[model samples]
Target chain A: LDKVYQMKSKPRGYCLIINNHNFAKAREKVPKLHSIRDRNGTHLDAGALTTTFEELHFEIKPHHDCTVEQIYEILKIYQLMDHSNMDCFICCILSHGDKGIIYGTDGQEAPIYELTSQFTGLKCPSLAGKPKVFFIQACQGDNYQKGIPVETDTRYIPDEADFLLGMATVNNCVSYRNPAEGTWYIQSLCQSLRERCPRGDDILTILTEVNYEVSNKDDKKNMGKQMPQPTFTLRKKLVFPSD
Target chain B: CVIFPVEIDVSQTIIRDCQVDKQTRELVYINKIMNTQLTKPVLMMFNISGPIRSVTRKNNNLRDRIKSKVDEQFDQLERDYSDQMDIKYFKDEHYSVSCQNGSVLKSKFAKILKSHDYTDKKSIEAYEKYCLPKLVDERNDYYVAVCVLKPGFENGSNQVLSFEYNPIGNKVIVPFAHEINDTGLYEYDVVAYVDSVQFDGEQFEEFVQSLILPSSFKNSEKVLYYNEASKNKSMIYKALEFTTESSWGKSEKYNWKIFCNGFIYDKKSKVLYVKLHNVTSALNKNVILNTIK
Candidate 1:
């Protein structure tokens, strides 16, 4: 059986959320950008993500405004958990960011690769060969995303298996927030997961739907459209228990 | 080494005023005999050592001169080392220390931070408030001073060197016997450091460069260089002592990048130069490998 099938029979796993909002020291280093606004809206995303995961019996552990060191420490702490009976792991990070990096409250930038690589099969053996999912709700870069016409899309497998990085946008573009409701990507994520999971669809399939929903929606912050990017390398289908 | 004012309850401890008036209420001198344990920050030693001749926490003219000399050496180190050398050290087993745009010594050791961008005062304040106070049980933390005591060396003529105000428990424990009689003739070499340093071995030796003095800074025009002493191992031995603290992060893999007070001995000139050093080293991956040939 595939690794996903192996996990289907077992219990659920943990979810970690690192919500970094007030980067006070960051403002000193970066003059113009202030503490991330629409933080209250971020809570909407947090609440929704928490509830959705909780419905699936996953325990959610959340932290806020942590330094770069603490983020790595938290990842290491969770990486050591006994996942013998766990089906999968999920993590969500909401922070101000730049290309390939996330900012701590102290303005230090931690590379995105450091976060995901820690749970690789080689690093954390217990979670080895299991699905480790991450959802990032931050701009990949500083520029805004403008759209273009496209043809039918195709999917490709990642070099490593059973890992997924759900970026809010492609590199070199901004992910928009309403400054009222929530981030376009996160709002669409919760909506699609809730709407599609009960319909017997796998998470990747649901996330693709989330991408479509996020892309189609208008972003008030952008005063235009924003697109979401979900990259994955799952070997099998991940069907959440729909009962 | 840097020294900062660390107030200890010296009410019962031996105290003396050095001024001629002898009317100063506070004591300028502290005798090593303590009824209780005294502790101070490691960074403080690195701060005050340059400006003051005697190890006591008093600032004087001679101390100020040495402090400037120490500052100049550190500034040179910052000007010298950079990530440009990261390529050279990558293949080598040992770590190499370097400086950024400013003198870490001038910034007051604790003020110079990595990635954490703050003003010097703010940085020092933050470090003292957060980092230094909690280091009470960090047995991994340590400082290294190389000394020799035939005559013209700082803290030399000293039988032993130790943490006078170690912060582990807030106690002033002086190394060596208190044998000073009169005339206030304190014979000890001043402490100093250069800049970034990384030695290949866990222990110091003759053949394998002790790295207490980087080969680059040893013979420069600047006075920070370790002068020559006659090659006499009997009268002068390079005193090597290091704190056992390891502030290395466990969750993430990183090399040790730390600053310590460094004082190196020169075999040719009989002069010992004290300066500050930002030292970097690595963790031995294989315990058995480190032990094996």
Candidate 2:
């Protein structure tokens, strides 16, 4: 009788990871993106995501160092797939970003809205009524603030219902990345999902915990802080049962 | 001026038929059944009451003096009623009302009642065409107006007041005590037709957590109530503040800003008067309600 997202399908759904690590092509092709550094430790995030989602029964679809066009092509392919048997859809974008746009391997920009709109109710009918979750690991801007012990962006108006956008940082704020350990948002996100999902915790509640963990981390060199944010228009509870 | 408390039969004020408008897709209801069409003007006022913290700007000495006097009066009221009321003091900012265009509220309610009642179409037509327009007309003595919170009254607060509608009379007078803000500079009140009910804290939290998930296709958040399993009593009111993508577009953020859905549940009859978009038949008892019961 409790209102919860039906995560009953055999394979919960596809967990698409668009991990862009190398920026060599981007630096060569785009002069404006010359300052962009290669994401040295992003593979750890992808591996953690794969392990976490795999345990939760999602079929992991990982894409590495995708160009702008390649990113669109991959999303279009999944968008057109018959997801009638699936109960949910997940997409994780691990890349460089600014404001409301994410960067590809070639340094080309892709609006976060355009990326998420591909699987709207009208475009992806089979996935309609199902939860389409997105975890974006990227800096929203270059600015940073003093780190606080605990806390908590973007105007992402969901075209249809059941969409959740979990941004790595608040708008106009830079997120943190440890070249060795992986990004703060993605690492904390995976840890939370692994610990909380089996206990029947809802996605928002888990994200709140992620916010606390991510916000607590301090960038000693820059004296900066990072805080994760989640904007959702979910109508019911989303729980991944351990059974 | 001597003001006497007018006696009103609260039973007559109970909303009867709850229906959705086809034009705007909003919740509309009529308190009393339609009888002989009337001459009395319909006055609609949205009573939004909630707590607010006081803040003063820099370099305003005169304003500070006035604020101190206001604070004194508020402190006196709080001292008198703190024991009798559910008083809450928050160091951080709390709830307040956002002033919206009165005409916008009027337009939403324009054909609402007319669309709700089909049995007497002509009489309802007169109310809409003739009586409703006079609400905004300044020249008309019997001005049917929609009153909202005065501007600059409530600032820097997130908590909002619930909606209250009285269809039978021209003047709406509600009996409720006011609570002062933590700074003792402002006062706020709670206004609603339904009686507030308390539930077991743990069970209520669990019930809230359950409905927090998103529905499949349509973007919606379900409003919930907590019912005592043994006493058969329930609190039927807006339990959460939800913002959904409006059908209009993303630019119109306030289009689907549902502060409260105005849900009325009858504990004795076990029937809920809820608002839905388009329903051909009456809504069956909700599964969540049954579980709580």
Candidate 3:
């Protein structure tokens, strides 16, 4: 019989997802790409913020043949790095993506739903009931708004074990870009994330502020044009730089 | 009638009066077979003794090739698990753990869900409307259904084993008298997966593989009664706690490719990391292992 794990220590891990296929991976050819701003009504480039995280290697889809499982496996690896060594993990995907799926180097598509949900506290016991932050730079939907009566108030995430899904846009939509600067969503995300994270802000607030900045950013075609949606019921406000 | 949260502190706890550390860290080394949803995922923890620190062994060329082929699947995922490493740890008698919560119960569902997805909110709403309040629904005594691997997985008995559910703490706890009907095998895979997807999106995502379990599987003298948490008016109360890391699948044939020998540890975060290693250490002809080989 295999040995049984003893109840001695709890572990943690983090994951992040950034879609560069449609954004900053290569913006040299695209004109005016450097000045794109975010929802905050400001002009900014996302390259800086996307690169702020440490130890995270740039994960590029090898080709169009990449599968959602591939990304899932990569993200899962972070969670399984060293049980008892890690507490939880944060996975961010920044690429050309839309709701329900993200595209890879090989034209392979993977649904965010399939990727994030698998690591739930139960199915992926390695992350069970722990914080697994997923920072995604993909569009959800075209629907844009300041705010609406949330669907439900019970929207708080559970404590100890939870997953935070931060998407660049809402349901089905197109994020902004200045061709030269990069996508508006990421630049603002980086700035807001940098500013709020150091001050002890939970993920929601930072995300909320990201929404506030990107949503209100000045734009030629559309004003206040950036949307990010969060998924999970947190027991309390969770912030980055949580250590 | 009343329900609460189940919390367990992963320190200074005893499994069998071992006076060992209650590894509270949720992270653990993950095995491929254990990662399967079909298998009852077990928790990864210190084997009876504890997680391994280091080991030594010998290997040959043929053995090395075979081991690498097995470990190839987990590359860039975790450290390699080879015959040498496997034998070293097993021979050394390192500590390991099971990735199982307790069981499920009706009362455990009574609490509230913010209903991120329509399914979760709907489940609770449907139950409240049709299932009737606590008193009328005497559907207590939940079973800890377990999915077995190895021989017990073939077609002999119910793979979904039963344990106990703690309504108050909302956890699937282990039972004292766990009998497997003597299947003549020692391998098994167990996890506390929710029976159904009562919700969608966040709710569904919330329950996926994020299993919990009982701290101690002990028996009670006086029988108590509670709907969803009890049945047949049995005399056993369940306990629950939180945990990450899936259960390793049962292996009757000693398949090293699908097996995890020991795990990694980090002192800074005080957490354990255990994803499958990319290759079997037995096959590594690189300089790192050349001397050892």
Candidate 4:
């Protein structure tokens, strides 16, 4: 057993998922009209992504709406409502791939910077220095190597206190999609929850598990292969203590 | 500055809201008076998901005074709206008993209805616990009604027909069946309140109307998937008695009408309903002998 626990010290409370279903609707039909994925291969479903959010029964406050602004507001309000009520907060955003923007249901794209800036101390001080985990699968809108170029495996861990933005696919590429079983990124997410959450998991272990499941699991359609990469700025490995 | 911090593990990595020390950290917002919206409706909501014994006894005990007051106002409305033909009756929620007029809503009625919930004993008790006494009394602008009816239709044969109100009108419309005219003798009560101290003259009318139809009580304005069991507790009820908890899912609001219950206050509509349940049956159903308290 690990000598020290990596579990998130903050109260583990809520999970919010916001998904934008339409991805490059106008460009997808047109061959290579535009491309914007992320460093790790993934597609964006701007509006429908919220559906992937789990742990609804844990919500202690009332906030039933759609929009990034509202999401930030809820985080801030609850931050005041219970202050130390929960340890970790997780956000899963699914939206169209772009250089940097998550589209709302109305097709109105919101810049990632403006949307996330709301979570900062300038707007909401309660969340200062807190582990506000953001799992983004939006198209960052930049693609480099199309056909698998040089493949080298490596593990990198900076501190765990900062933020982690896990993008899907590189910029300027068509993010893969499966009509029958939902997005490729989500399939890996669920598997991680099943395995890591119960394994006396911390957020990182589970996230790592998700990374492996996606990269290893056969996604018949996206080839018998998968690779998911997550960037981190966290200060320490966060996990659920109860686990 | 109450730094109610949430204690994360000792890693100090995943600090949530509570972890932030309030002494040093600035408060989220200073001296901002909370503008909590009043829980709406003319103060009618029944947390019945429990045994009906308490509800039945409570409503039954006050049944006479309630029935009498309800009848009095209901008659006045019928006379006022003679051409429009008024209706009257008590409504049951899960297990609560209260009066209800029609759903004819008016701007003024909104204010009156809003006070019902907060002025309630339960609401006041909750407020007194967290809020100061001065702030608690700020609820003087509210009107709280008591429970008056439950299930089993204590009356025999005569069934309640309907509970309706206009959202734009100031008078409640009631119609009764004791007579035969479907054209309905029109009766009108305060669509909102006629004005007075504390609450208003419409207080009695609103209270009565709430009982005749479940609409008067804390009628859930939103879709709620509430389904459970008999209330085994108070404050936190399990389910309503006298009637099964309505699993009114997300859909049209009126789609949830119960018992075609009518509200009648006019002379021709007044008829006593009596159900002399066998001692054994009543006892088994958790009903105590109707006693004047």
Candidate 5:
């Protein structure tokens, strides 16, 4: 028989969606973030994630337009909670980012490693040996040349195992977004999960399918391309079978 | 003794080839050394006679100046002859010598020689004693993963066989019991099995060359897990067991274990061997073979 993660909990785990859309306050506070435009369609991504995880039997916790401090407080509450009965944990962030730093709604920088390290095996013993998946749909950088095909990103993560960091774009590249439609990565991910999870396809296999789908998408106006990168140290096959 | 008449012009500097007995460092003047009697070390003796006063201002330390010049000339000559002489030592082993481009054996020899400063006699001796045997075995000896599949299984069991030749380490480490079962339980054998034997160099090289192709192995996305039913088929698995600090200050340690399954195929024999053990389920068959092969 094929190996698969044990996802037997009634409510598999908490799927925390931290979606930052309105960056008007950040543009006013930080001069460097003055050019940061508000994410007009990020709510669509948050909604898609909520609906996807809800179907997969996860309790959805959505936060909108949070400062860096508020994001930490929210994470601290979940980090301190006993997750003994939970089989998996997921966190999806949609915001502006550069390299390994994800920006809050207030334009404060939070290292992705610092955020993921908080839920390490030592820090969260109850969640030890369980898969902690993070999907960050943010621009790793603000550089995109017109009429040129660019490649992927290199982001940082905690050294611990059983964690998967799925970046929207390869390091130091911008991810595409539309004011009307959701992000290329999150949408492709939700679609891949919805399509493949029923057949009991593993997470990496599903992610590969997502990668194929997102890579085929090209920003015709900018002549730009995006590639989703999944960095994982998971020791077991992570599969979310259909309820 | 076959003697060729030596005509020495006393006014000119000349170098003559001589032989030194291995047992007793006594020098012998010989016209030519035959292939059948080439065990003794051959030496080249330089005879110097020059008008030093013409080259130097004073004749007071003329002998010392000529000696210095002779030493410099000898060093240059030694450097010129080193590479050729080393090639001879390699060829004497009855292996075909080729330092051509893209020669695996040549690269292996270069790697061995690079580790030591070949100019030093002690380093050369060390290479001969230690590194040379390994290289000889790499060319002549082959290794096989002697997997005793389901060791105590009765009749009706199929005989599974495969071969893997790793020219890098010249050794294959097959893990016996390193797996984590479906219930998160770790299972491993007390001892791992390894087997090696000698093979003809020509046949081995032919096999290796045929296996080379434009395509390369890629990693698999599925993680390896211990399956009880897979034991029915013969296989081998690999795992890396390591320890790391689990907590920051309290000195608690955790085992960072990685497990993978191994698949080996012998193209010539049409035999396939698969290994299944519990460790990390993240790697596929190709990645595991790439690690060892």
Candidate 6:
């Protein structure tokens, strides 16, 4: 029974939003390249992510049109933000990407995992025991996921363990975006977070709906579909502060 | 009703946006970022998934049965709100359907004419060539049409029965419908607006033609899936009824209750749509009924 109520208090933290939409230098590399268009709807994604996180109580620092070097530097810069008073740290990356790599405005690519590991327990001991949530709203690969039956996992949350990576699409698949609106994964996440956060639901439960929606999109276009995948090492139910 | 130190929540964090301790200028931008783009328009979307066919599925042999079925549905609407609603029969070719054969290799239409989605140049040029010649084409080919009923207002503003989504144009309404590389995934876009304002068919058609189909999977536009159910016709209708009952500030520009489904457009993919649902002005329900009578 004690475990049920053993939730961390809403700690002071910051949400870093690295939105690389207008890849000015990368425009030539993107335009009409295998259906790759300039990232126009990225702003919508930025808005959704920022608002959702802000509602969750994180002071959001949104940066748009970042270079690859800037992406790395920004994460490093956050390490100096002094997380002692912070209970958790969140990062949202809205970019043009492929598995393991996110494209910067300067036409270069950066590894996704390396970005997450920046605040690892060893590097940022201040955030070691705290939750460092990374939400990546980018494609993991170029594969389309077809539907299978009611199929689905691993659950092992040890004490003092932390790090949650929420990828918009699975390791290798195309993610859908509304050119005028935003990406399917990001929008769904924002909607779910808004609906469920107030209910005191944990992040995992919140993301379950995201996975279902992103997977069930049934994008008949481009012979593709997508499924979001999340990997976390939290030992407790991770619920964002609602009140 | 204005209190002090009001509590407002941002991004899931709690703050004050209501009657608060300080009535500072910051209250304005508190609800800003999250909703700036993902703003929900006062509109809804419906994907006519097979319901049109279902209207006459029981009797395919019958002609105009589907149109009659739709008419019956509207009749019920009139009956439900007889005082405010006046149903009528108004036909205009500018407000018509666009049909496409997904695969030239698949259907009978493909036998005589190559299969084409709405995006095909030749397909767009001769959309009438493939659309339902009559109310019910009886062919399995993809058919899409938008219906705008010119019903005048009774006590309040009448809703426009036709909706539009256009980017790179005056209005930003984005409707994403395509036969994804011939995958039998029949896609259709239909918007219903109240006759609050007159719809320009020429502008709408030109907007539809402007949407250059995405060439790659990465750039594909977002899709809103629609299934069929006779009982639930459209969310816009429900919203209009709800708006009519509730009180919201009316936009002076439209003079009617401005219901927007929100502007959707992708810069890279060129995917865009804006659905504006009008719930007032000009179109009176009774006028059409009287004219038809």
Model 2 per-residue lDDT tens digits across residues B25-107? 11111222111122332223322111112211222232223323323322221111000000111122221222223344345
Count residue pairs with overlapping backbones in model 1.
Answer: 45
Q: Write the per-residue lDDT of candidate 6 for residues B18-137, one digit (tens) a residue.
A: 111121101010111221232211111112211121110112112122223333333333212111000111233212222223222123332222112333455443433333232222
Q: Model 4, residue B116: what's the lDDT? A: 43
TM-score of chain B of 6: 0.17
Residue-level lDDT of model 5, residues B1-293, one tens digit each, is 00122323211111111111221111111111111123322211111110001110122133223323333322221111000000211122211112211223323433433223333564444544443333223333222111111212122221111121222232222322222233543322111111121222232223222221111122322222221213223223232334444211135544433433333233333223322322223211111111112
lDDT per residue (tens digit) for residues B1-293 in model 4: 01222322211010000011211111010000111122233222211111111112122222233333433432322111000000122344422333222121111223322234445665544433332221112223211112322234333422211111111111111111011123533221111111111112132223222222223133352212121222221010011112113111123222222212112211232221111111011011100111111
Q: List TM-scores for all candidates, in order.
A: 0.42, 0.44, 0.33, 0.33, 0.43, 0.44
Ranking under lDDT, best-scoring first?
2, 5, 1, 6, 3, 4
lDDT at residue B87 of model 5 (Cα atoms): 21
Question: Scored by Cα lDDT, where does model 5 land?
Answer: 0.51
Off by over 4 Å in 1: A1-4, A7-11, A29-38, A149-159, A220-223, B1-293
Model 6, span A86-112: residue lDDT tens: 778889888767768877777666898
Going through the candidates in order, what is chain B's TM-score? 0.21, 0.18, 0.16, 0.15, 0.18, 0.17
Candidate 3: segments with Cα more than 4 A from true spot: A1-19, A22-51, A55-69, A79-81, A141-161, A222-224, A240-243, B1-293
The better-scoring model by DockQ among 1 and 2 is 2
Q: Give all candidates' CA lDDT scores.
A: 0.47, 0.53, 0.35, 0.33, 0.51, 0.46
lDDT, model 5, position B220: 24
Cα lDDT for residue B81, candidate 2: 9
All candidates: CA RMSD (Å): 25.2, 26.0, 30.2, 26.5, 29.4, 23.0
Model 2 chain B lowest lDDT segment of ten: B79-88
Worst 10 residues of 4 chain A by lDDT: A37-46
Q: Please give the range of 10 consecutive residues that has the lowest summed lDDT in model 4 chain B.
A: B10-19
Please provide, for model 3 over B99-142, each residue's C-alpha lDDT reduced to its tens digit, 9 standing for 90 to 100: 22222223343432211123355444554443223212232332
